[PDB]
Symmetry: C2
Subunit: 364 residues, 2 copies
């Protein structure tokens, strides 16, 4: 019987190699909070979550307070084997702030795996160690956008996630350029980040039909709450429609399933508040015959490893896991081999294998 | 034209006279963040919002960061007259954190009113100065609860909000005790804070009908997201059903209107992110023939004043505004006369009429 006797955090700031721009925001960096749980046997578990305030509403400052002043009193002194009960009772005290919850759920999984002397991926039941990711391309003018895609293709990515929804006229013009520049061995994924209205979405889909493109998904074309439009688009489209911001948790998944509002759900740990809730979504989706992909915020490689581990355990093969491509290799090379576009888990790691304490000063 | 050239924040904590406890939480104090906006003509304006993390997810520390580092760059240097656009631009950078938005929205309205040398209530179109509130009663054992109610009645409240949803057997037994101790001059409002399932809700409603009791509303009996159950309870019930946690913003209001999931919406500024979004809810409800009441978190008298101002401007007469009853009179006596159960705005205040001098400058 191991008990959690300490909880500490540290902020992590990472610079991006190039500017990330979506319909929602623009950034050159990632802000994350790491949490450390210490067992009474000295073993330490870790989780890392992004603060993407425009999407999940999380802030580093809110996460720190929640974890150290709200969750901590519930967790401290509790048995590791009571994790499900502990997380349920702790999470009930906080509405939203899903990324804060992600950090805690991940640290618990790290502990659970380490206590069994296995990786988290293995704990969750993964067989495979490799998942393929697209690379995503910032909003920008057509010329710049074609250049970024060529860079991705030269880097060995054949699945390309094209951000749209910032400028609809630009989005339409871009299709022409794509059709001219790339073959059908390149697979496109469009993600509007809610930036289109219903009419524009249908128009974009009709426009795709005018060219010869390999298009795999249309992701979150409209506002997260316009489930009626999502259903209409899903019925209209010959291309699978993906819900992202429309689905954070299991009850969101129930709603989109009930309303036939997508063909596929993009599961993200920063939205679900960690692995436990993501598992519940996957079960619901499976029962409903809805497929799942995994995705992320522009977030640290640690979140990517955790997400890859989950996907491998759940037989999820469609992934937008690209942040590794936006940051320095040394940030992930302790735990991941990225042979683009393949994210490969390194062998024989205990827990996730993040190796955070070496570079970060944790404080209670 | 006036431009906003400075933004400051301050944390304010206030003690409660007695313990507030619901199905949600238990507390002896209020945590608030206040924001001050300064125009380049010297006029300052203020808004104050609660951090009730279990409900809106807001934290003091989160609100502080959001206002200083996210909202401030958008607001600073902007024209006051552009406020609708400025707030739209600012709020699109932040999901949730509605109480942080409330603080900023209120400070803008304080400025707007002060620029016209009038109260915010007057700015919003209010004429009347007074609104009746219930008093709310903490969860407790039956005997405890009867005593708290008697205290309220003795204090002159005739509308009583009874918190339920923590212990269902207690809730059911309590009805017998109410029917025994009280006549129909006392009107009850039950708020389960989501604590009941569908079966329990129908049972409580049937139980009510076994007695002689004046029952005005049943509030948020089930989970905020179970709209199907809300719609079923609404159809089943002979008592008006109120959506609280099911409606934060206008798009939430559209959903409950579309699904016929309530008879009435409880509008709170801490959920709406301030007055502009609250006005949009009111317009939608009006169009759908859905009534509105106003409500609050357990929050500062400044928030209560802002909410009373909105209600008076919107012809909303049903209110659960009680926190004034939970704090020392000298906190609010400058801008409000609470002669129970009447919340009455003082004459000739400019803007809201509260200031931060003790917090910021002393």
């Amino acid at each position: 019987v191991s008990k959690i006797i300490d909880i500490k955090t540290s902020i992590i700031k990472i610079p991006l190699k190039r500017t990330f721009i979506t319909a929602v925001r623009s950034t050159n960096h990632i802000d994350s909070l790491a949490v450390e749980l210490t067992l009474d046997n000295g073993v330490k578990g870790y989780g890392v979550a992004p603060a993407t305030t425009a999407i999940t509403g999380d802030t580093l400052q809110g996460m720190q307070y929640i974890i150290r002043e709200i969750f901590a009193p519930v967790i401290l002194g509790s048995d590791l084997s009571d994790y499900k009960q502990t997380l349920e009772l702790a999470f009930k005290k906080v509405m939203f702030n899903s990324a804060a919850k992600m950090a805690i759920d991940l640290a618990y999984h790290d502990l659970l795996a380490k206590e069994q002397d296995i990786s988290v991926a293995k704990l969750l039941g993964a067989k495979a160690n490799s998942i393929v990711t697209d690379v995503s391309i910032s909003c920008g003018n057509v010329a710049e956008t074609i250049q970024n895609i060529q860079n991705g293709v030269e880097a060995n990515f054949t699945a390309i996630k094209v951000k749209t929804g910032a400028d609809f006229n630009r989005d339409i013009q871009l299709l022409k350029a794509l059709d001219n520049e790339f073959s059908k061995n390149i697979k496109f994924r469009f993600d509007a980040n809610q930036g289109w209205n219903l009419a524009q979405t249908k128009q974009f889909i009709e426009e795709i039909n005018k060219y010869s493109l390999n298009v795999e998904i249309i992701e979150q074309p409209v506002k997260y709450y316009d489930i009626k439009a999502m259903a209409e688009i899903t019925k209209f489209s010959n291309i699978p429609v993906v819900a992202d911001e429309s689905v954070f948790d299991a009850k969101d998944a129930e709603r989109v399933i009930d309303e036939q509002a997508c063909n596929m759900i993009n599961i993200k740990l920063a939205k679900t508040g960690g692995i436990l809730e993501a598992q519940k979504i996957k079960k619901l989706a499976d029962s409903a015959g809805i497929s799942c992909m995994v995705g992320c915020m522009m977030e640290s490689p640690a979140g990517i490893l955790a997400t890859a581990s989950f996907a491998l355990a759940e037989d999820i093969t469609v992934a937008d896991l690209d942040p590794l491509d936006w940051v320095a290799k040394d940030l992930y090379s302790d735990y991941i081999t990225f042979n683009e576009p393949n994210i490969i888990l390194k062998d024989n790691l205990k827990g996730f294998g993040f190796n955070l304490a070496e570079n970060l000063y944790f404080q209670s």
